[PDB]
Amino acid sequence: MPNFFIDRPIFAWVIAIIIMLAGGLAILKLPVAQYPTIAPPAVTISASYPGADAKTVQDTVTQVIEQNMNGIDNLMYMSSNSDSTGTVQITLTFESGTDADIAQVQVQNKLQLAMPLLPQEVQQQGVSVEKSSSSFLMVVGVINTDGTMTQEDISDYVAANMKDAISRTSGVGDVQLFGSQYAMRIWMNPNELNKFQLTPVDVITAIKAQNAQVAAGQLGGTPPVKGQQLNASIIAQTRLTSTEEFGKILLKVNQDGSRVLLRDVAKIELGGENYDIIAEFNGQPASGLGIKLATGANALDTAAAIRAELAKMEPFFPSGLKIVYPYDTTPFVKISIHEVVKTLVEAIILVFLVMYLFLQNFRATLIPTIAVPVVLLGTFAVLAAFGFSINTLTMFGMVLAIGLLVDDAIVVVENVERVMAEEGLPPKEATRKSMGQIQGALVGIAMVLSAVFVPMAFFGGSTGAIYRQFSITIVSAMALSVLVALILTPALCATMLKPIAKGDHGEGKKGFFGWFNRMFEKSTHHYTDSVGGILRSTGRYLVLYLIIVVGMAYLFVRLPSSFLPDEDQGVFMTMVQLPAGATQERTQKVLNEVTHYYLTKEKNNVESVFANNGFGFAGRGQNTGIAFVSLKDWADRPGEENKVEAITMRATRAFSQIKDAMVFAFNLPAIVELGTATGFDFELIDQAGLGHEKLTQARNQLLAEAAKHPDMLTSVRPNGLEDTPQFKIDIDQEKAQALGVSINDINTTLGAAWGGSYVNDFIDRGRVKKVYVMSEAKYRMLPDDIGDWYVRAADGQMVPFSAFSSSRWEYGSPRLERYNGLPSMEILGQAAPGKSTGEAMELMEQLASKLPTGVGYDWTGMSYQERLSGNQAPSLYAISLIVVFLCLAALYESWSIPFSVMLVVPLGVIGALLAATFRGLTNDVYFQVGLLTTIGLSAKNAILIVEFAKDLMDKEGKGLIEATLDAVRMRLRPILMTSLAFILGVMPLVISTGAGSGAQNAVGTGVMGGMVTATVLAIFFVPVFFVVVRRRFSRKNEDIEHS
Amino acid sequence: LGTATGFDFELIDQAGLGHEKLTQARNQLLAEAAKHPDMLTSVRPNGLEDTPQFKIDIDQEKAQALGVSINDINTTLGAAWGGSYVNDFIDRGRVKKVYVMSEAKYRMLPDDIGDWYVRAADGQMVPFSAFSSSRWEYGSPRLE
Amino acid sequence: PGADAKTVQDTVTQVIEQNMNGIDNLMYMSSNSDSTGTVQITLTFESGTDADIAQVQVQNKLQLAMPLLPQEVQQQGVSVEKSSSSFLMVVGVINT
Amino acid sequence: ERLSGNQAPSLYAISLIVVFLCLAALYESWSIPFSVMLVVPLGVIGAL
């Protein structure tokens, strides 16, 4: 193949240009996002039952839906929480790769047949089936800088006008509002209702009667009579539209004629659908939109089109409406592109330099500088062909691939320049000779590199998804390089290189380059002599190799492993936890103290703070809250003291003074759709009919045993909320029956007053919205207020609640956790300093196996992925090893020679294990992908060294030692060129601080160290390996040359 | 697919303007587009124009006075003049619908409205002309 | 049955319209609500979107709005169709 | 039409380029391809 394109350079160029043309044509069209789909696909059932407690939600909704989730494909586990705010969320998670749409749909239908078993209240509020593991693209905040709009007014504009036109903008696939559109609120007054012998019952009845829509038919309706000349819609009662119309609803005409109107017994206003969430943006009223990307969509273009559409709506906002962007992942991604493109640009610059250092002419300098961009660019087209996207893992996969891409180009050009210089051939026939030597090896090189990286893609779970990115990206670029190395680079070597005379090694040049040629000629003779003297006592250095291998093992065991590096992403969070039953106003004072700290004592670094009172990570309730901290650009946060990692500590430090709450700030994980990165997640389950009480005790029993092993378990805790006091009220069935007061009159009065009631719909400015009746606030606050509510009897007398009700206090959960249809408690935790989580798990397993009978347990989340993946890394790379051996066995046509190449693996491994433990980093996936890229380069140089030595023995008849010292001489210069340009290119990644540095540090520090030891050791070790392996496995007449 | 010719333009209410302000904006656009016959030909709405319709109002106070529940009122009006799907029957082994509706001659003109009666809680039969006032107005037969 | 266009729009059309969100490869949603008591809401997808997958997502989104329609509309049925498909023939049945 | 108008130029700017590269490979020349490619307008007019 090299010869065909040596005789057609323009054809080779047409292939290269076509390759490049498809790569850029791709790039323009590939999706671009931070991380590919890594979280397993998950579907979320969310329903609402206004006014409920957690138990009510669980047993009228949660359990009903839970008992119908069966017969569904590729399902892993089903958790649920039912909380005191009247909200259930049941989440079902599927195995990696299950068709997202197909999964949702099956769950959708299974819920459908349970829908008639839910209460009308839950059905009317709606039961959403979501695809939920998808991540937030941005969070739009909508404030009013004038101050003429509450968060409910802002919400309603956003809902009515902005929400639906942003669901329509390029690239979005789900939206969620921070509040509610308007709900017509009827704030009842109990003393007025009792004044006119009225109850909430009658108010609801009247709103249902006078705010309604009626089918009235038609004048001249079909079928008509003969000669009808008029056909017209008959318009009967329509929906109400204003607070005044609701005000004049005629409740009752007294005997004297006086009309009891709705406004006479209640206050009437537009309002929120519920008031459980307080959303503030820098302490100002705010609503907003949480936005998620569409599957397979570009993230940069979705933000650009959304912000452009928001800019298209701006002039049509009422005064003061500012759109602010407190959360947005777009900027961190543009950095990653700029940085990886930067890294790829400056990688090529360092090859132009090394090529002109050793070869000293700009003609040879141009060939690698052409072929590598060809290969990089084309790889993008290859990734379009498999469905992939321009992401962190793939981009870093390409920068990790640079080393292999360049060595194909250097080996070819150098070997031509060497063949031209050592033999005096014209550029054409010398390229022919050079390629004839390395072609077969370059092919076997490609086969072996694949056997290393391909097994990565067949890891399972979320980690397997990550490796798949690296595996496919790296393999694709490398094979494309070998193709280019057999097509274009031979053509370029034949036509561009100018003749070098035979014997000319630049030793006669003057100045910088003349000195260099002679120095390297000296050191090469030193190297070949040193190698010649090492082969005299091979027994000694096989002992050095052994010490080297056991040192690798001791390093690998004591290097702590991680998932992905935490990154300074520009935002972080803070959790607020007041005591049980703590109120809304109490949380708000705390969140304002939180926002005041960030805007004062972090004034340089914090741009904005988005506080949410009412919901948190641990659950919902008046006693939980969240604030999102939006920081200023990394450009204006210089040094470590202005990074997220540092800002998060100073917040938690200063909130240790806070006495009202428990406030805790923390940075995001690298992949937020996944979470954890640290430790285990343990669920404790009620398998018998034990109940919440016996379960919480078993939880604390486990937590006390786990706190009594601080050597192994640290920070074991429940994820859920603790029980809170609650007001139990009992209806005397006998006295109610006695007084003639029906139980329905009793309950609907209590609920619609204290919980509120969705009555019907009205039309607010052409948009249909809800109508809630609820007691005014001052009459539903304390147990004394219970007495001021009255129900009418069958005789017509008004009876107070204190007549047929007794009330006490008791404790209950504001957030019931269930796991797999059974009551559960989520227990979080991790391994102690310097311990394994797989072994901290087994202690937790043992600590749970001493809990009372009827209690079971299970691992969930990350801990479950580990239970069914731990035995992979050995087996996958036992396979990987075998294919490398068989490839070498085919390339060299020998069962024994392969060992001579394969022994170079530990030489590169230690350098990584050094630099990582030296720099204090972790065995994360960036490091491991780096390990595979470094092992591959050391093996390639070993292959080409062994190839040249064996070729010299076969087709030139030389002896073992001569061919060894001769091939290792020839391969010296290219091997140094490669390791030089590669170790320089990874330097900005190693010293990197600021944005994306954690990943760049991770990919970087491991590779650089691995390559140093790979190049410095293997130049001195692979000549040993070939000699001892050839002497152990042979027949006769080898050390002595032949014909 | 259709078309092959020309454009299709939708005019939208983005604020809470309403059908009325929208139709006016439509005719404003149509008049400007008819005043550029050099460029725009045959600009027109796809939808139907508004038609007269018979508005009938129920006096909540008088109905309350006479002891005539509003449900008795509305279900009578609708099932007579619009008809009502009541339940199913079996026609030759095949389940089919059962509609109740006024006979044609009693649901044709506004005078026919008066000939329909609703019973009060006391047991007296009350005509529709007792608790209803009616006028004429225009509305759309096809809201886009 | 028996409605005007407004009644159809605001008891049915708007209710269903406000639930058509979170659907893949959707381009635009038009509707007409007419004086004959009939609404038709049509949702059009990009070329190549899986016909079955598209219908099904719309089907489910309507399902959760169904309890907010009137019993009259529910009893008459709410059809979800693939509609851009063309007429093959039209059979006429007369009695000579 | 609003999201397709800029296609006919770009798609056939691409189409032109591949015709040139193919001819460049067939004839092993960067210049000879022009000799074939100039025949396009000769057929176009007859259609127009």
Helix ranges restricted to H, A810-871: 837-848, 862-867
DSSP H/E element including A454: none
Q: Among partner residues B18, B51, B74, which is closest to A214 by beta-carbon distance?
A: B74
Chains that touch A (3 or more CB pairs under 8 A): B, C, D
Q: Parallel, antiparallel, or unpaired: how do β-strands A713-718 and A855-859 relate?
A: unpaired
β partners of residue C33: B143, C39
Locus of tokens 């939600």 = A57
CA–CA distance, A578 with A622 (Å, rounded to integer): 8
**What is residue A414's three-state secondary structure?**
helix
Please choose, from the candidates A661, A521, A483, the residue with its C-alpha nearest in 3D space to the C-alpha of residue A580.
A661
Q: How far is CA A518 from CA A329, A524, A531, A977, in A?
A: 54, 10, 20, 17
Structure tokens at B107: 């649901």
Q: How far is CA A216 from CA A157, A717, B97, C1, C2, in A?
A: 33, 62, 20, 9, 6
Which DSSP letter does residue A832 get?
A: P
Phi/psi at A179 (nearest 5 deg)? Answer: 135, -155
Q: Classify residue A107 by burial, with Cβ atoms within 10 Å: 0-12, 13-18, 19+.
A: buried
Phi/psi at A425 (nearest 5 deg)? Answer: -75, 150
- A29 inside 8 A of chain D by CB: no
Inter-chain CB proximity B142 and C34 less than 8 Å? yes
Q: How far is CA B79 from CA B72, B76, B85, B102, in A?
A: 11, 5, 8, 7
- D11 inside 8 A of chain A by CB: no
**What is residue A605's three-state secondary structure?**
coil
CA–CA distance, C28 with C66 (Å, rounded to integer): 22
Inter-chain CB proximity C6 and B139 less than 8 Å? yes
CA–CA distance, A949 with A963 (Å, rounded to integer): 5
Please choose, from the candidates A711, A1003, A978, A960, the residue with its C-alpha nearest in 3D space to the C-alpha of residue A832.
A711
CA–CA distance, A377 with A797 (Å, rounded to integer): 86
Structure tokens at C89: 């023939």
The Cα angle at residue C56 between residues A763 and A61, in degrees rounded to 5:
65
Cross-sheet strand order for the sheet of B132-139: A218-219, A232-235, B51-58, B132-139
Spell out which residues of chain D touch residue A17, defining contact as CB-CB under 8 Å. Answer: 21
Mutation for testing the D interface, residue in A4, A14, A20, A169 having most D CBs under 10 Å: A14
CA–CA distance, A628 with A290 (Å, rounded to integer): 13
Please give the radius of gyration of chain B, using alpha carbons only, rounded to the nearest integer.
Answer: 23
**What is residue A264's three-state secondary structure?**
helix
Spell out which residues of chain A touch residue C11, defining contact as CB-CB under 8 Å. Answer: 213
CA–CA distance, A274 with A181 (Å, rounded to integer): 10
Spell out which residues of chain A touch residue B23, defining contact as CB-CB under 8 Å. Answer: none
The Cα angle at residue A20 between residues A17 and A25, in degrees rounded to 5:
120
CA–CA distance, A192 with A247 (Å, rounded to integer): 14
- B141 inside 8 A of chain A by CB: yes
- B78 inside 8 A of chain C by CB: yes
Q: How far is CA A430 from CA A417, A603, A956, B44, in A?
A: 8, 67, 18, 78
Please report, as a single letter, which amino acid is at residue A572. Answer: F
β partners of residue A280: A285, A611
Please report, as a single letter, which amino acid is at residue B88. Answer: D
Cβ atoms < 10 Å from Cβ of A129: 24
- B143 inside 8 A of chain C by CB: yes
CA–CA distance, A445 with A884 (Å, rounded to integer): 10
Which chain C residue shows the shortest CA-CA distance from B83?
C2
- C27 inside 8 A of chain A by CB: no
Inter-chain CB proximity A215 and B82 less than 8 Å? yes
Q: What does the H/E/C string look like for A78-123?
A: EEEEEECCCEEEEEEEECCCCCHHHHHHHHHHHHHCCHHHCCHHHH
- String of DSSP letters for A931-979: HHHHHHHHHHHHHHHHHHHHHHHHSS---HHHHHHHHHHHTHHHHHHHH
Q: Among partner residues D14, D18, D28, which is closest to A11 by beta-carbon distance?
A: D28
CA–CA distance, A72 with A94 (Å, rounded to integer): 10
Contact in structure between B57 and B134 (CB atoms under 8 Å): yes
Locus of tokens 């060497």 = A418
**How large is the angle between the packed helices A972-985 and A997-1032, nearest 10 degrees?**
160
Q: How far is Cα of residue A918 from the mean position of the Cα atoms in its chain? A: 29
Contact in structure between A335 and A391 (CB atoms under 8 Å): no
Phi/psi at A341 (nearest 5 deg)? Answer: -60, -45
Spell out which residues of chain A touch residue C57, defining contact as CB-CB under 8 Å. Answer: 101, 105
Contact in structure between A576 and A587 (CB atoms under 8 Å): yes
- String of DSSP letters for A30-93: S-B-SS-S-SPPEEEEEEE-TT--HHHHIIIIIHHHHTT--S-TTEEEEEEEEETTSEEEEEEE
Please choose, from the candidates A550, A542, A551, the residue with its C-alpha nearest in 3D space to the C-alpha of residue A1020.
A542
The residue count of chain B comes to 144
Contact in structure between A286 and A179 (CB atoms under 8 Å): no
